[PDB]
Structure 1
């Protein structure tokens, strides 16, 4: 349902008759894993046969598709591919059976599953460590750079959870070098750094006095106010919304010659979407982005004023583990678009014949089936033609040398930093690892300190909808963002839910 409909159009002049061809994807249904012989006969596949005959233990996936035919003078269960099933999961034929019949299927009751079978070979997915999304991190920069502090964030949506874009706010000016010490930001798909005041004005809040009321919540702090002084004067001449939005569009990687009448309307998309998309993407909600932008600048200056340490990149609370679920969704997303474009490219030829396509001839199940098999068998995380630049080693042959080694291998985690880059920080055992990853178990050699192993009582969060939490916060006294003023609210606590500033509460202790 991420891209739920395909749409075509032709303005029939050949008595104009707009004929939109539309295909809608509906419910998903799953079947138990099935071996289909060259004969044609089918039966339930159990893993022991799959290992012996070098088969893939996988389930056929069927998808409802619906055709519709708009015409204006002015299907059913199509098979889309096979998905490998994790042994002992809910969709594996061993999950039932019960101890008596397990022995008849030649399966060992001590085998706890957690792995896949691809061409007879047992493949386990290795947890991939990444930085958290939707969090602000501040780092200091090295001496031969005009920048001294940088704030960074990678924005990723909640639904799907997938990456979108990355954004930075750099503070220029060295120590007594760099003259005007102003602040410019970096926006996705714009070639050059844009001063902060300009983007504030470009969102609909233009007079200085309101801008500073969104950032600094302490009118006495003259040190912080003095550092924002050059930013006002270097963006003074941009005195209204329209010339601000146009200043942006004249840099954003587009074509040459889209004129002011539209170059604004192209930049309004780069501001509404791609810039902080985790907050919201519907229209008429620019108050949330303006308030959030002020928070970032506030955090940037606290570190530059030496009132707060720079963030520790190795703090485990700022980290996430991608396991089997999230990793497959990202791969399935890429392959399903590839299947989609092959359907679209096939309709433009098969409708010029004006012949009703039999649907089953427009879904090649080899795209998903070969895609998932290849990536799980080699560990190359991407399209086969792009094997470099893609991440390697996500899937590995399950070590079965001894029983202890099987348990460790299924609980391994990997940080994909490299072998390039010496130093020590990602390799060290950080204090916040206590009780979450083992302090002892780590490989010798090149991977030392980068590959880690989950402590015995660790667990991984499956994920939970944020919507019930919002309802609970407003029922117990949280006040909206339109009601908030630093002069009136000089002491209340800010409330974050998955990194988006959603409200303020004046009595946090009871809450």
Structure 2
């Protein structure tokens, strides 16, 4: 029955494999989008108010149902056809499906003359579709079906195709809503502040933040204030309580202080009462609120109405926005004050801003919902204006012409295309970085980009606290994978078994709590709240309970049986403070864990047995979760959980550590993400090395996707001979690194050989490189289109001619065909022409606008595709193919942060060799190891020697006590090798033995995208910028290198004044001006007629020539634009 330790390493990984058979790696994206389409769009459409318009006749126009068909495309003839994602990629279409809404317009004029007209399936917009979602044509297709459609079966999906560009929505971090968080700002007028970003269940407005603060000590005592929304002045809490109908001080403290035996709380609230005694009735308090507001009505009536509306709608919407909810709002605001007092009295800890239990991940669904709310509101507005301008004339109108569908369509398309998350007009208030271009450089880069999280703290911020790896990231975020540049700690990555909750309605839970012995908050007396336990659901205090323990037992049993409580519902019992917080909302990152009985796992051997035959008896992960054996625990419920790292922790020990565990890790290696799960032995490296590899696995070459032959990507690198690593971890089985690997096993020798590998460099074998070692192919796609925008000027693909075309370069166009397009198989060098495009003029009647190769490439045309774009003019894509043979300067890396460029390449006779004539493919310098402490590199090399000599694949899973260095060495000594991986090598040049026995063996190396040929650049009098006549910027522009301020300072320190003048004047922008010797302002010179005159001074004899930079002339002219007179006085 029990899984014994000897079977555990199989059982756990069997369980893990079942998880990845059920979910995958992009499950969060697909589930978010599915919830958005199934629920969020319908909720948004129904939550909009019916637009009642009347001059008389009236019309309501109620939207009642939505229909999202499959993705289709409409040609110029208008025939709807099912559009495949690959066709969208090739034709630069948007993989979107039409959204139709049912509309009901009832005519009501007078005399009960009512009649309803329903417009079924009114086309309301087009919604882009996430690939492999339920509403994707690739849904449920087999691998054969996907291959029939020219799709990769290993492609995870989880992205959109907008204008042929694959866009991926990055999950955005945000502070959780409807939760009270008591912080303390050191530099502020308030000692303590308790904030609550409140938002109603079905979002319709932004988060309304309410603060309840305490004024810092230094009138008599500490005063509690409340910064309500839409009010620009602090308001005493007692005033707010009275404005809600609680005038008696006893009632207010009944709502705030639940234990009247506690004078500390009492004296700390007393200043607030003493400050609010002149105001003693609800109307006066409402008038005070309205007066403190930023729109103080001259008459107290409208002041009181405004205060009523604010306290009913903007104050704590999550508690309830309807009327008669003042009791719930009073209880909740009293809870906020109670929490603030507990913090000020030291009875509760301040809340941690960085705790991921306090955060939420805004995924594709809830982000598209924000867009859709804004866009549907704008659409209903436009419909209101259109219908109003017609009914004002007293006649009917056609809603089909009122609905301008471009709002929703173009809005979603623009937002996903650019990443600016918001309305196109508010292009600066909008937050960019959402919806990035999917990284297709290697399969690991694609997976990681699809599992990418973002902390929008702002890269400019230099506070390290949000960048720090918090304790609560354990199991939810990769500890290693993070960019090492300016976004350290802000851009994160999901751990492998991390699941972001999609969201759920609290209705069944609340109903069960009602049927259960919970007492509502309006029905109780406050005297009961002392000993009772509060119950919050999605932040709303809904009631109280008397035995929280057996309530938690009941709820956990219900969630483990897949009863009314769904698996993703978090249920935290804080014991010391008697809250029970239940969460069903979306964005809660959680992970699966094995539940533990008294001191035993519930995962018995029968579950492993049924999981082994997963493909026959359809016993899956969901059956494991439904059995009550596995549980999803979120960051906030982990605080109440006692984990076992392994079932070995559940053994009874000579001194028991815990003996009351509640859960167990499925495997600790699941704390790593996609790119860190490729590192072998990451627990033997320094952690920065693991981070650098997690970044560098994403630039590694491989086969980024199986269907690369049909993709017209702008840039693509494919390795000739990718190999799976000889030394692998058990997590790559689910990353599909074995099916799409990104490196080669290289016989690497760590040695000092000729000095060409010093300081992070490598010596490669020229003979191996000749045999296809780390050879790659680079595919570059050029796009072009001939626009017939108007009869004024039209472009067209056609072989240009020297007699008709004007802007025709001296390059030869013979490689083009009469259609103007080069043919596949044609070898093209730099500056060559691949598309001959000519544009009609207003060298006559047509000008050359041909597409050249990006300079200095020298490839062969791989293929040419011709089609029609969305509007329907001819559209061409040409993929050119360039074989990249590794060379000096190309960057290579192992899986341990050990990067370096090729210093030199030696032939096989020049490389050092073992007694059996094995030469290293790569030689790396021993000095790269000691400071870096990448012992995982050495253990991987030794394990790889054992694996190659044994005919197996080494197990480098991080935390594995069945694999240590002594075992690997003992294994290697059985194959006739030195047990530590050393060998006697001979000098290739002289054949003499090397005195020091070299450490050599197979290690998995990666070829990175950074090849020297894509970086080398030179300039000598090339093109210049228009504004300031200085060299351009970039290799692509044939630009010059920037001689910056620091270079100026260095050369000033050198004392090299002529070199400094050459760099900053003569090699950048030499220029001449003519200055009036009297006024010092630039004069008018006419060198052809030799007439120089200053219009200002009315002189034409006292002019002087001045040699100045063009940028300085431009500066002085831009100062004269500002009415400044910079007078260059030559005397």
With the length of structure 1 as denominator, give the TM-score of the two structures.
0.94
Report the equivalent of 2:261: 220
- Contact map agreement 1:164 1:274 (CA 8 A) in 2: no
Write out per-residue CA displacement over residues 360-415 of structure 1, whole angstroms, 9 at most, x where no aligned residue: 21111111111111110100011111111211010111111111111111000001
User: Do residues 117 (structure 1) and 161 (structure 2) align?
Assistant: yes
Question: What is the DSSP-based 3-state SS (H/G/I as helix, E as strand, rest coil) of the residue aligned with 2:400?
Answer: coil
User: Do residues 157 (structure 1) and 217 (structure 2) align?
Assistant: no
- Contact map agreement 1:169 1:186 (CA 8 A) in 2: yes
Shift of 1:173: 2.8
Choose the corresponding residue for 2:291, options 234, 238, 250.
Answer: 250
User: Do residues 502 (structure 1) and 542 (structure 2) align?
Assistant: yes
Choose the corresponding residue for 1:473, options 513, 525, 540.
Answer: 513
- Contact map agreement 1:58 1:83 (CA 8 A) in 2: yes
Report the equivalent of 2:107: 69
C-alpha distance in 2 between matches for 1:30 and 1:219: 58
- Contact map agreement 2:184 2:192 (CA 8 A) in 1: yes
C-alpha distance in 2 between matches for 1:178 and 1:127: 46
Write out per-residue CA displacement over residues 461-495 of structure 1, whole angstroms, 9 at most, x where no aligned residue: 11111010011112221122245445455322111
Report the equivalent of 2:64: 26
User: Do residues 57 (structure 1) and 95 (structure 2) align?
Assistant: yes
User: Do residues 341 (structure 1) and 389 (structure 2) align?
Assistant: no
C-alpha distance in 2 between matches for 1:297 and 1:34: 55
Question: What is the DSSP-based 3-state SS (H/G/I as helix, E as strand, rest coil) of the residue aligned with 2:273?
Answer: helix
- Contact map agreement 1:172 1:178 (CA 8 A) in 2: no
Which ranges of structure 2 fall in alignment gaps of 5 or more residues? 1-45, 113-117, 552-1131
Shift of 1:92: 1.2
* Superposition map of 1:198-217 within 5 A: 198-217=239-258
C-alpha distance in 1 between matches for 2:251 and 2:141: 68
Report the equivalent of 1:425: 465
Report the equivalent of 2:680: none
Change (3 A) 1:46 1:509: same
Question: What is the DSSP-based 3-state SS (H/G/I as helix, E as strand, rest coil) of the residue aligned with 1:504?
Answer: strand
Shift of 1:55: 0.8
- Contact map agreement 2:290 2:297 (CA 8 A) in 1: no
Question: What is the DSSP-based 3-state SS (H/G/I as helix, E as strand, rest coil) of the residue aligned with 2:54?
Answer: coil
C-alpha distance in 1 between matches for 2:472 and 2:412: 36
Shift of 1:275: 0.6
C-alpha distance in 1 between matches for 2:49 and 2:235: 36
Choose the corresponding residue for 2:75, options 37, 44, 47.
Answer: 37
* Superposition map of 1:373-384 within 5 A: 373-384=413-424
Question: What is the DSSP-based 3-state SS (H/G/I as helix, E as strand, rest coil) of the residue aligned with 2:513?
Answer: helix
C-alpha distance in 1 between matches for 2:522 and 2:378: 43
C-alpha distance in 2 between matches for 1:103 and 1:482: 61
Change (3 A) 1:489 1:83: closer
- Contact map agreement 1:442 1:453 (CA 8 A) in 2: yes
- Contact map agreement 2:132 2:139 (CA 8 A) in 1: yes
Which ranges of structure 1 fall in alignment gaps of 5 or more residues? 11-17
Shift of 1:191: 2.2
* Superposition map of 1:7-22 within 5 A: 7-10=52-55, 18-22=56-60
- Contact map agreement 1:173 1:179 (CA 8 A) in 2: no
C-alpha distance in 2 between matches for 1:131 and 1:44: 41
Change (3 A) 1:351 1:173: same
Write out per-residue CA displacement over residues 240-280 of structure 1, whole angstroms, 9 at most, x where no aligned residue: 222111111223333643x2334322321111111111011
- Contact map agreement 2:212 2:225 (CA 8 A) in 1: yes
Question: What is the DSSP-based 3-state SS (H/G/I as helix, E as strand, rest coil) of the residue aligned with 1:388?
Answer: coil
User: Do residues 395 (structure 1) and 395 (structure 2) align?
Assistant: no
Report the equivalent of 1:15: none
Choose the corresponding residue for 1:129, options 173, 180, 183.
Answer: 173
- Contact map agreement 2:247 2:280 (CA 8 A) in 1: yes
C-alpha distance in 1 between matches for 2:103 and 2:527: 57
Shift of 1:21: 2.2
User: Do residues 139 (structure 1) and 193 (structure 2) align?
Assistant: no
Write out per-residue CA displacement over residues 153-195 of structure 1, whole angstroms, 9 at most, x where no aligned residue: 1101112376341111111132xx2544211111111121111
Change (3 A) 1:160 1:198: closer
Write out per-residue CA displacement over residues 35-75 of structure 1, whole angstroms, 9 at most, x where no aligned residue: 21112233211111111111111111111112111113894
Change (3 A) 1:375 1:296: same
User: Do residues 358 (structure 1) and 398 (structure 2) align?
Assistant: yes
Question: What is the DSSP-based 3-state SS (H/G/I as helix, E as strand, rest coil) of the residue aligned with 1:361?
Answer: helix
Report the equivalent of 2:502: 462
Question: What is the DSSP-based 3-state SS (H/G/I as helix, E as strand, rest coil) of the residue aligned with 1:273?
Answer: helix
C-alpha distance in 1 between matches for 2:516 and 2:377: 43
Question: What is the DSSP-based 3-state SS (H/G/I as helix, E as strand, rest coil) of the residue aligned with 2:328?
Answer: helix
Change (3 A) 1:97 1:227: closer
Report the equivalent of 2:946: none
- Contact map agreement 1:154 1:163 (CA 8 A) in 2: no
Report the equivalent of 1:13: none
Deviates more, 1:213-222 or 1:404-413: 213-222
Write out per-residue CA displacement over residues 448-467 of structure 1, whole angstroms, 9 at most, x where no aligned residue: 11111000111111111101
C-alpha distance in 2 between matches for 1:278 and 1:425: 30
With the length of structure 2 as denominator, give the TM-score of the two structures.
0.43
Question: With CA pairs under 8 Å and 6+ residues apart, which has the higher RCO, 1 or 2?
Answer: 1
Report the equivalent of 1:106: 150
Change (3 A) 1:71 1:255: farther
C-alpha distance in 1 between matches for 2:291 and 2:58: 36
User: Do residues 372 (structure 1) and 412 (structure 2) align?
Assistant: yes
* Superposition map of 1:86-97 within 5 A: 86-97=130-141
C-alpha distance in 2 between matches for 1:474 and 1:352: 51
Choose the corresponding residue for 1:231, options 254, 268, 272.
Answer: 272
Choose the corresponding residue for 2:310, options 264, 270, 276.
Answer: 270
User: Do residues 186 (structure 1) and 227 (structure 2) align?
Assistant: yes
Question: What is the DSSP-based 3-state SS (H/G/I as helix, E as strand, rest coil) of the residue aligned with 1:442?
Answer: coil
- Contact map agreement 1:156 1:278 (CA 8 A) in 2: yes
- Contact map agreement 2:529 2:544 (CA 8 A) in 1: no
Report the equivalent of 1:79: 123
Deviates more, 1:465-474 or 1:31-40: 31-40
Report the equivalent of 1:302: 342
Deviates more, 1:451-460 or 1:354-363: 354-363
- Contact map agreement 2:156 2:447 (CA 8 A) in 1: no
Write out per-residue CA displacement over residues 338-358 of structure 1, whole angstroms, 9 at most, x where no aligned residue: 111111111122223444323
Question: What is the DSSP-based 3-state SS (H/G/I as helix, E as strand, rest coil) of the residue aligned with 1:148?
Answer: strand
Choose the corresponding residue for 1:166, options 179, 198, 209.
Answer: 209
Deviates more, 1:87-96 or 1:322-331: 87-96
Shift of 1:231: 1.2
User: Do residues 332 (structure 1) and 372 (structure 2) align?
Assistant: yes
Pick the structure with greater CA Rg. Answer: 2
How many positions carry a matched residue from both structures? 500
C-alpha distance in 2 between matches for 1:487 and 1:26: 46
Shift of 1:310: 1.1
